[PDB]
Amino acid sequence: RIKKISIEGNIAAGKSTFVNILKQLSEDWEVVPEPVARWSLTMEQKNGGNVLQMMYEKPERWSFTFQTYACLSRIRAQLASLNGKLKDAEKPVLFFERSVYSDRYIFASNLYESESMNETEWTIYQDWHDWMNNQFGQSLELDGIIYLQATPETCLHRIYLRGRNEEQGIPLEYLEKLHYKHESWLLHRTLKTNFDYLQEVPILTLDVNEDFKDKYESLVEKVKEFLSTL
Amino acid sequence: RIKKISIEGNIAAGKSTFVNILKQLSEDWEVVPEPVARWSNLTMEQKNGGNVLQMMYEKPERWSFTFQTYACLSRIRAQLASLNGKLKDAEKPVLFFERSVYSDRYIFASNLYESESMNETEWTIYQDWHDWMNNQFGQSLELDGIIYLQATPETCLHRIYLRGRNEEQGIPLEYLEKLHYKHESWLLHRTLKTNFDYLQEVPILTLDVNEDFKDKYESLVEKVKEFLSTL
Numbered sequence: 001r002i003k004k005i006s007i008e009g010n011i012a013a014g015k016s017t018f019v020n021i022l023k024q025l026s027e028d029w030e031v032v033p034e035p036v037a038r039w040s041l042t043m044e045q046k047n048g049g050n051v052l053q054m055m056y057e058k059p060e061r062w063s064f065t066f067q068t069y070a071c072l073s074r075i076r077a078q079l080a081s082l083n084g085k086l087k088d089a090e091k092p093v094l095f096f097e098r099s100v101y102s103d104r105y106i107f108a109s110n111l112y113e114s115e116s117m118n119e120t121e122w123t124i125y126q127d128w129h130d131w132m133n134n135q136f137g138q139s140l141e142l143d144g145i146i147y148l149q150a151t152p153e154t155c156l157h158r159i160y161l162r163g164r165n166e167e168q169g170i171p172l173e174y175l176e177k178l179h180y181k182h183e184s185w186l187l188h189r190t191l192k193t194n195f196d197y198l199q200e201v202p203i204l205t206l207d208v209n210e211d212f213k214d215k216y217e218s219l220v221e222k223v224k225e226f227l228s229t230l
Numbered sequence: 231r232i233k234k235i236s237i238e239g240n241i242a243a244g245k246s247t248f249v250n251i252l253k254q255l256s257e258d259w260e261v262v263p264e265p266v267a268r269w270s271n272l273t274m275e276q277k278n279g280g281n282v283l284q285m286m287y288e289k290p291e292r293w294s295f296t297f298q299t300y301a302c303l304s305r306i307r308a309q310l311a312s313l314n315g316k317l318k319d320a321e322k323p324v325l326f327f328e329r330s331v332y333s334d335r336y337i338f339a340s341n342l343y344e345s346e347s348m349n350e351t352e353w354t355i356y357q358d359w360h361d362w363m364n365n366q367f368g369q370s371l372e373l374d375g376i377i378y379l380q381a382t383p384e385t386c387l388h389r390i391y392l393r394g395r396n397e398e399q400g401i402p403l404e405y406l407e408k409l410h411y412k413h414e415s416w417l418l419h420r421t422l423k424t425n426f427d428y429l430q431e432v433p434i435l436t437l438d439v440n441e442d443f444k445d446k447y448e449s450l451v452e453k454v455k456e457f458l459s460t461l
């Protein structure tokens with residue numbers, strides 16, 4: 001009964017920003033932030049922190065392990081949020097900061113294509129993904145995708161603005177690549193997924209090139225109309 | 231009503247041989263071969279497993295964690311499948327698992343980590359994942375008992391020569407030796423800590439299988455039926 005909406009977009013595009021905004025605006029709207037974001041006390045933070053640093057230094061060694069733990073943490077986190085909150089809500093919405101589909105068809109895919117995962121790992125991961133989402137992940141099924149579309153330069157600049165030590169070393173080239181896989185999934189609908197229902201999930205796309213922190217009403221007005229057509 | 235019983239033992243201790251003898255005594259009795267045994271010679275799984283298997287042999291410190299997660303997923307999937315697929319009609323169903331998810335973690339994944347083939351982060355992520363999932367199933371795969379085929383590492387070493395697999399012909403004696411202690415500790419001395427609540431009180435049948443039993447197995451089988459009636 002809770003409506004499940006993935007916010008999707010490139011690194012430093014503004015999702016944490018958009019989703020922080022939205023949640024304040026109705027007691028029937030809650031967010032599930034992205035595990036990876038929290039990694040940059042708990043054993044998951046601890047595990048998260050190490051594997052992310054590991055990943056930065058040697059991605060062709062750590063990428064399969066990193067993608068495995070990121071997806072798992074997300075599945076877990078979305079469940080915690082779902083089976084917990086919003087049970088007394090009139091019009092409940094959970095906004096996910098990315099989805100298990102980003103995990104795979106953006107990030108993991110890019111790492112296969114860029115040779116930081118070899119073929120065995122990628123098909124091991126794909127097998128792990130196809131089946132972890134079917135055993136325990138079926139209640140996570142999205143009612144909508146919201147795509148926060150923004151330039152690779154926007155993001156580099158926005159990376160700088162946030163000032164995460166490790167991210168400043170991230171270059172335009174990767175952002176371009178990551179920028180490139182989103183468009184193919186969310187705009188053209190070029191992507192065959194192993195999850196057919198995604199063929200029918202309605203998408204909304206939102207231009208976040210312009211700063212929106214003092215000026216998001218048109219942005220939130222667009223979401224509001226989306227939600228009532230789902 | 232399905233009873234789930236795990237058959238545990240070192241490399242070449244006699245698990246499959248025994249299980250194949252057990253499957254034939256009872257229309258009521260079924261078996262789940264362990265998948266790394268099947269890769270230990272094909273589907274998409276069998277493709278990945280042969281590949282990941284050979285890579286583990288080539289360089290364990292790089293592939294342990296990858297091998298471990300995939301072996302256990304592949305085990306859990308075939309074991310969920312039997313419970314849903316096998317033995318539907320039978321009046322007293324018993325499913326014999328060739329090894330278990332506890333042997334994945336507390337014998338093999340633990341030992342690779344002790345042998346420094348997985349780091350703390352590889353180990354703690356493995357364990358986290360092993361729980362989340364093996365708490366998700368709430369009693370479905372949980373064991374009713376266990377049968378430990380007991381051999382000396384020395385018997386085990388011979389048996390690999392008989393079995394004849396090229397790619398297994400260098401497993402050294404000391405490798406078989408650490409796994410022995412892990413079995414011995416876990417299932418005979420019962421000194422191994424595990425995080426699984428019911429498993430401290432899981433009944434355990436120890437059979438010495440050092441003597442060739444291919445053509446002389448009746449007495450073993452009597453302990454199994456004997457053991458099975460207590461459940």
Ligand SMILES: CCCc1sc(-c2ccc(OC)c(OCCO)c2)nc1CSc1nc(N)cc(N)n1
Nearest residue numbers: 036055056059067070071102103107108111114116
């Ligand atoms: C946001 C920090 C996560 C990182 S770190 C990283 C990285 C760092 C350094 C790299 O080069 C040395 C690198 O190159 C990839 C090599 O092909 C990737 N990529 C990533 C993106 S992969 C990813 N997968 C997810 N599933 C989720 C998520 N947020 N990110």
Ligand SMILES: CCCc1sc(-c2ccc(OC)c(OCCO)c2)nc1CSc1nc(N)cc(N)n1
Nearest residue numbers: 241266286287290298301333334338339342345347
């Ligand atoms: C017998 C084929 C499976 C293999 S291969 C292997 C191995 C191979 C080469 C190695 O280095 C040369 C190796 O070194 C570990 C040294 O401490 C282990 N260990 C194993 C046992 S780990 C295992 N984990 C499971 N979960 C299941 C299972 N049957 N085996």
Ligand SMILES: O=c1ccn([C@@H]2O[C@H](COP(=O)(O)OP(=O)(O)O)[C@@H](O)[C@H]2O)c(=O)[nH]1
Nearest residue numbers: 011012013014015016017158161162211212
């Ligand atoms: O319209 C915007 C959206 C975001 N930001 C800034 O861009 C950086 C990255 O934003 P966010 O943390 O939302 O990135 P994401 O969650 O997409 O990785 C942050 O320091 C924000 O303060 C901004 O200046 N204008």
Ligand SMILES: O=c1ccn([C@@H]2O[C@H](COP(=O)(O)OP(=O)(O)O)[C@@H](O)[C@H]2O)c(=O)[nH]1
Nearest residue numbers: 242243244245246247389392393442443444
């Ligand atoms: O009583 C026995 C038991 C086993 N074996 C042989 O020893 C090898 C090891 O058996 P198996 O593969 O069943 O052991 P597992 O690894 O399954 O425990 C095989 O070639 C068996 O044919 C034997 O000669 N006599």
